[PDB]
């Protein structure tokens, strides 16, 4: 049956791109970005 919701406890944030888990929120959130580092899709005046 279930048990458990979220882990265990420690507030280990994964990548949805490759899958990679992190410690850190903000280390994550850095590595996410070379996924979407590719080629110019289309970027606005911003
Ligand atoms: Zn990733």
Known sequence: ???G???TGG????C???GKAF???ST???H???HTGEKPS???SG
């Open 23 to 25: 410690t850190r929120k």
């Open 5 to 7: 919701s979220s882990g």
């Open 42 to 44: 289309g970027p606005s």
């Open 11 to 14: 507030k280990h944030f994964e």
């Open 28 to 30: 994550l959130s850095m």
């Open 16 to 18: 949805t791109e490759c």
């Open 32 to 34: 996410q970005k070379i």
């Open 1 to 3: 049956g279930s048990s």
